[PDB]
A paper describes a structure:
The HAstV capsid precursor protein comprises several domains, including a highly basic amino terminus that binds to the RNA genome, a core domain that forms the icosahedral shell, a spike domain that forms dimeric protrusions, and an acidic domain with unknown function at the carboxy terminus. The HAstV-VA1 spike forms a dimer and shares a core beta-barrel structure with other astrovirus capsid spikes but is otherwise strikingly different, suggesting that HAstV-VA1 may utilize a different cell receptor, and an infection competition assay supports this hypothesis. The HAstV-VA1 spike structural domain forms a homodimer, with each protomer encompassing residues 408–684. Also similar to other HAstV spikes, the structural domain of each protomer of the HAstV-VA1 spike comprises a core antiparallel beta-barrel, formed by beta-strands 1, 9, 10, 16, and 18.
We began by studying the capsid sequence from the first neuronal HAstV-VA1 (HAstV-VA1neuro) found to be associated with encephalitis in an immunocompromised patient who ultimately died after 71 days of hospitalization. In a different approach, we generated a larger construct encoding the C-terminal residues 394–758 of the HAstV-VA1neuro capsid protein (~43 kD), and expressed this protein in Sf9 insect cells. Despite low yields (micrograms per Liter), this recombinant protein was soluble, and limited proteolysis with trypsin resulted in a trypsin-resistant fragment of ~36 kD. Mass spectrometry analysis revealed a mass of 36,020 Daltons, similar to a predicted tryptic fragment of 35,970 Daltons that would be generated by cleavage after arginine 697. Thus, a new construct encoding the HAstV-VA1neuro capsid residues 394–697 (~36 kD) was generated as a fusion protein with superfolder GFP (sf-GFP) and expressed in insect cells with improved yields (milligrams per Liter). Following removal of the sf-GFP, the HAstV-VA1neuro capsid spike protein was crystallized and diffraction data to a resolution of 2.73 Å was collected. The structure of the HAstV-VA1neuro capsid spike was solved to 2.73 Å resolution. Finally, to evaluate if there are structural changes in the spike that drive infection of the CNS, we aligned the HAstV-VA1gastro and HAstV-VA1neuro spike structures, which resulted in an RMSD of 0.78 Å and TM-score of 0.97, revealing that no major structural differences are observed. Specifically, only six variable sites were observed in HAstV-VA1gastro spike sequences, whereas 27 variable sites were observed in HAstV-VA1neuro spike sequences. Statistical analyses confirm that there is a significant decrease in antibody binding to the HAstV-VA1neuro spike compared to the HAstV-VA1gastro spike. Thus, these data reveal that mutations present in the HAstV-VA1neuro spike protein result in reduced anti-HAstV-VA1gastro polyclonal antibody binding.
Author numbering:
A (entry chain B): 408 to 539, 546 to 582, 585 to 682
B (entry chain A): 408 to 452, 454 to 539, 544 to 583, 585 to 682
Amino acid sequence: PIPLTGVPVGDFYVYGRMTTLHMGGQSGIQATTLVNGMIYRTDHPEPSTSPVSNWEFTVLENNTIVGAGMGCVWFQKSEVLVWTLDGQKLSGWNTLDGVGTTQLTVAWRQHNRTIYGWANVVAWNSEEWHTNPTLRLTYWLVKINVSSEPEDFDVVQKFPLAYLEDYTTSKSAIQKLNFQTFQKPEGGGTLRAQYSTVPRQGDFAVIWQIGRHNFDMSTGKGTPVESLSDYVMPEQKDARIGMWYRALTSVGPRSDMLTLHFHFPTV
Amino acid sequence: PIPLTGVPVGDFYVYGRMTTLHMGGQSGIQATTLVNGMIYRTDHPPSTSPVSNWEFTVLENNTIVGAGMGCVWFQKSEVLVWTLDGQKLSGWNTLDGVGTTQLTVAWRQHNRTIYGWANVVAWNSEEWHTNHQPTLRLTYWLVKINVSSEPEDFDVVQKFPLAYLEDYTTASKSAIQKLNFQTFQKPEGGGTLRAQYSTVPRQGDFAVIWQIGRHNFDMSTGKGTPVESLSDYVMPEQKDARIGMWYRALTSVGPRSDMLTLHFHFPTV
């Protein structure tokens, strides 16, 4: 047997149980199915000097927004395997304990307080899908610097789904070529973000954003996504990053064995 | 560097690119987003050999010991295979020459049910509580394809997973029901939807067929019960799954293919 020793050198895979941050719910009811709630707040009580994207997380370089975070899954370095490849041969069975982070920071807007310097970007990956900047799905591996306990709160939440036109609950006219993202309320015109579990300092999380934005795979920087709507995808897509179905699922469990591939800075 | 040597000994993990069989579509329009198309055909035929209400049917001896509602396929070369010892790599193996079981998958195409299409190799199942009725279970089988059949695109009733929406509005809001798992019909124009089979597997390749809904399964024999129908579901507790299949099996939309990881179990003694 090969023990999980060493630190991943170069691009590396991370496979293990990853837990969704908050569940789409309503006060009193345990939210168990709505896995992809994306908090979308345009109101900016943030001082103009300290900016934050229209979403929950905001990737920043030096006070400048270089990305956004709509979804968040988190894990612990003790529950995940890490391996790096030589083509398709195993070149490392390593652990994240002692991984190096970048200067890039992630800011977490929580209900009524935003935690600047919540995490430091470690590695990333991204992929585009042309819709006619084009639509991209970018995610970041981040190392968590602080330990915060978020507060459940009702907020408007956009979800991924299909473009239906004659909806019934048990048949609806489905549009192909079409990705749709829209808000979904329960009770108020918003939806409760039920933070079931929560990571801590030293843990790891994988935040991501999907939609029209630009990204640069060597610097880890890009642009935040402003808004989400309908998207017409003309041709097919055979993706390689390994998280499109998780980022497009409407309903799922809280956690599941998910695999991810991450790329280090290569300026 | 460690090479891909040997066949997986024991329960193994398969990571790689997995391409779906057919995309939910319509004549004229290329089907690029409808990734979770589950063909539901209650019309059964030639009655001499059984068939399930879905596209694929796992049969031990003409008994329907399972059913296949979704399908992703790949070739043995585009996957990583590794078995574990807790957290230490027991083997960096390949599917080349892996052993199959006597369980057989039959594929009901448009007007052609190809029997002995695949032989089951391994399996995994995960249940999620829903309330002599079976619990909701997700069961997928790793199968070794024995033919190179070229299927035929055709329009039928197609089951699709999604949330429970109530006051729908698009172009866009809909009262969303938490705790709720809805699986309904997704046709276009008429009453059915076309299955656009594009990249189709060949002999010697592998596929992952899975079923979701009310059914029972045995992780020791690989035999279970087929899923009759799909409706609404209420999941009072949360699920922290461990099979790595729920998000791909429950997404309403997604790319034709992507990288997935799956844990499989061999026959138990």
